[PDB]
Paper text:
Short-chain dehydrogenase/reductase enzymes are a large protein family with >60,000 members involved in numerous biosynthesis pathways. The short-chain dehydrogenase/reductase family, consisting of 60,000 documented enzymes, carry out the catalysis of oxidation/reduction reactions using either nicotinamide adenine dinucleotide (NADH) or nicotinamide adenine dinucleotide phosphate (NADPH) as a co-factor. SDR families share several standard features, despite sharing low sequence similarities (less than 30%), including the Rossman fold domain and the active site, consisting of a highly conserved tyrosine, lysine, serine, and often an asparagine. Here, an SDR family member from A. baumannii (Uniprot ID: A0A0M3FP68) was cloned, expressed, purified, and crystallised.
Crystals diffracted to 2.4 Å, permitting structure determination. During protein purification, the purity at each step was assessed by SDS-PAGE, and the sharp elution peak from the size exclusion column corresponded to a molecular weight of about 100 kDa, suggesting the enzyme was a tetramer (27 kDa protomer). Each monomer contains a central β -sheet (β1- β7), sandwiched between two groups of α- helices (α1-α2-α12-α13 and α3-α5-α6-α7-α8-α9-α10), with an overall topology of β1-α1-β2-α2-β3-α3-β4-α4-α5-α6-α7-β5-α8-α9-α10-β6-α11-α12-α13-β7-α14. After structural elucidation it was discovered that Gln69 was missing, and investigation revealed this error was introduced in the original design of the plasmid. Fortunately, overlay of the experimentally determined structure with the Gln69 deletion and the alpha fold prediction without the Gln69 deletion showed that the overall structure was not affected, and it overlayed perfectly with previously determined SDR structures. The structure presented in this study presented no evidence of the cofactor (or substrate) bound in the well described binding pocket. All four catalytic residues, previously characterised to have catalytic function in SDRs, are conserved in the SDR structure determined in this study (Asn108, Ser136, Tyr150, Lys153). In further support that NADH is more likely to be the cofactor rather than NADPH, superposition revealed a clash between the phosphate of NADPH and the loop between 38DIDAK42. This analysis also revealed that uniquely, the C-terminus of the SDR in this study, spanning residues 246VMGPEGLQPAIPRLAE261 extended diagonally and bound the adjacent protomer by interacting with loop regions 186–248, a region that plays a role in cofactor and substrate binding. Specifically, this interaction was mediated by Val246 hydrogen bonding with Ala143, Glu250 hydrogen bonding with Gln144, and Ala260 hydrogen bonding with Lys198, as well as a salt bridge interaction between Arg258 and Asp205.
Numbering used by the authors:
A (entry chain B), B (entry chain A), C (entry chain B), D (entry chain A): 1 to 260
Write the structure that this text describes.
């Protein structure tokens, strides 16, 4: 996976997550400069890890003013933007117990802000004929007990990816979505006691490949879809879930014999 | 379609539309008492045509207080609710031009308010072990130029229908969705000049059956899903789109010959 | 579910299964005469159960001559056919171990014969402006370990339903598919020891409604789609699986806590 | 797209097509040795252009003996196979007019032969822990007037891809599918008069990106899925259709205005 994006500029929302850092590293390795927009402070450290190749801009994407200031800063330090990766999300989700206020907050962060960040960067993507990668999940294709806000948000992101693709094609912008499964996480790392083999064995029940996915494995699909190798891919959902979404409630274990 | 729902109480949000009127008539004909919730005053007239069997309650479903008051009125005049048909929606939609405020408004009306209305009625549906029908669209499965808010809202309703089904099954409540295509509507009647054969001529290009759907044809599917005949149907999306969703950009006309 | 199909004639392939008998009973109750086409001899008993309302014609649907003779017999004893329910299938399936010969046999029985039986009845369905119901499964939407021939066959039936819908619409014929989950079966009845409560508790892990489906519950959806209440439903897949298809490998039980 | 597959051996059925040629070139450029299996003699010329790195073996994949001999020749000249690209297909397709014999022939070539070729190569892919790429189409997700056999065959390939992924995961073999839209082809070049801009003008109505796809653009996705960058991708369908599959019968042009 030796793609060449020398001189290009990329924007990565929610770049403080392990997937976010893998996406940033993938872009830097390809020669691109990256601006990380996130509310989490840890992002700063990530940016410093790449010295002048990556810049961190703490941004509340629900604030239009914060987005305008972030794009101004990107223009001042890096230049015109070619790639946008919308990875920002909130895990505010208590199913039926979540309130109307929680619903609107989660939708604003997970969905509406993707529109506003794309809009603030649209003229750049138009001039550069760039590409956009949004993030769905296996949760956008299936129901999970007790989780409403994030699955519904991600299903909505899927449709938004299609509509953006259609209405952005005229300007030469490609828009796709990436649908991962269980990926090694900071949260999983802490609840598991930083024990990867056990977390993998738990995940084996829901992934044909028998483990959690690596952030790098997700980042590869992001970079492919951004690159010109995917020049005839727009509006598509690229699954990187180790086979999660081909299975139903029976999993990968026989079910008929239980009847006897 | 001669189902018996004698004595059962149904609530139909967005009941002032042609679809809503057809659903109300289908329910009354089946012996049910109906509460019409809508922000449109036309609903009043509709209810009056059915004398004491149908009630109208002008409701802004974005107001929690309005929902509590609507449920109180239903309790006073009709009683415990068995069926909920979430048909309320807004067509506030300017594609990419729609603002953040427009996004959150359309999501509040189309999606979050469905949750709040379901929550206010949940104890009724649990005691009665009733059923819920949400409304998706052909717009939740495909992209349409210049339309973002309503397609995305309906794509979100589809996932919400699945997650509602899962977390409500334990209480014996079924939840499904209905996906109609182009159906005869007030707006189409106004742009058509109240010319149905002309509008049918336009819609033939997008429906295998060569016309717009009738509101009653949609109401039939709604009624089936509410009834006990659908007693093993939960979390499903039932299309009533005259073949719209089986087609792609080629429509129903051959396309290869055009290359010669 | 009191539909009126007086005087109509229906053909039910594979009518010897419990689902088949439920579909036949549903049609008879609606006033229709039914011809059961099947290779299984038990069908004869089923037909006798309805005296002169149902006729049995032992038919090898892989034999074109047998199909022509069956349609001749239907015309001699019953008349012009209005409804066709393609329920015939084989469970010849050993996954990767199944041979090319097994593959072609299973595809011939499960798929190609549906085309030939529709073709032999096409002029009837055209004159009567009838409807067709094919049978998919939850197996057409997901992968199941060790089962290739039947899932692939059913996925192919799904696409065939769409293509038939498109190319039959001009003649006023509607074509849909029904997708059930685990339904109480003869095979399940024998391996379970005719113990329904235990089989239901096994199935609860894969159906939100916590049991196997009843054949009658599937038959209701078949009859709806055949009837004129579904007059704007063509090319659609109507799930009657108690919520099986809304779930993934996590089932309906929490999965995050296992990580701790 | 600078992947390193040095020393690895790939097999490409149906390699005489433009897609196949692009995939062969992509693999060779990545350092792989390629075996071209096809019934078309044009493949011979293709292989000769790459001297000793690419081999051509004229094969009727419906003949088990031919497959065994093709694997023997691959073993003699190149060695153990790591990658399999199932691209062989027939366009024998007359919709409803196609006979039972035509159905079984098209299914044998398009679908069952994929299984037999995978089975003959399975021990290789298991030892090498390789990957398989099947070919679906935009025709597996939608209905097209007058075309049954190929759309249904491809819909079946989609499910076969999922079931292969599941039952091959234990052996470390990934299996995915690629779904292209209208791609430049020999047949289009013949009906077009070798006029690419004209054919692009026709295809713009069915692809957001306003043209036919290039064979190389499809080959890029094939190569990504074969490579270790897709190491958490199994059982997925990767669309490379220029936005075809996000559209319905309305295409990318507004349709509501037509009603006025």
């Amino acid at each position: 996976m030796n793609i060449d994006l020398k001189g290009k500029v990329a924007v990565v929302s929610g770049g403080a997550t392990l997937i976010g850092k893998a996406v940033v590293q993938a872009l830097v390795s390809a020669g691109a400069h990256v601006a990380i927009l996130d509310i989490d402070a840890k992002g700063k450290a990530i940016a410093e890890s790449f010295n002048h190749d990556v810049m961190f801009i703490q941004t509340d994407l629900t604030s239009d003013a914060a987005i305008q200031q972030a794009v101004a800063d990107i223009h001042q330090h890096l230049g015109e933007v070619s790639y946008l990766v919308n990875l920002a999300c909130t895990y505010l989700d208590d199913g039926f117990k979540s309130s109307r206020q929680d619903w609107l907050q989660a939708l604003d962060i997970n969905l509406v802000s993707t529109v506003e960040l794309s809009r603030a960067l649209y003229n750049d993507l138009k001039k550069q004929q760039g590409s956009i990668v949004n993030f769905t999940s296996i949760s956008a294709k299936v129901a999970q007990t007790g989780r409403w806000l994030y699955p519904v948000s991600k299903a909505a992101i899927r449709q938004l990816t299609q509509s953006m693709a259609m209405d952005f094609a005229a300007d030469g912008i490609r828009v796709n979505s990436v649908s991962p499964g269980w990926t090694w996480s900071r949260v999983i790392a802490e609840v598991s006691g930083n024990n990867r083999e056990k977390a993998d064995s738990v995940a084996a029940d829901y992934h044909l490949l028998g483990r959690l996915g690596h952030p790098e494995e997700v980042a590869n699909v992001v970079l492919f879809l951004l690159s010109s190798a995917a020049s005839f891919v727009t509006g598509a959902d690229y699954a990187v879930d180790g086979g999660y979404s081909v299975m139903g409630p029976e999993g990968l274990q026989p079910a008929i014999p239980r009847l006897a």
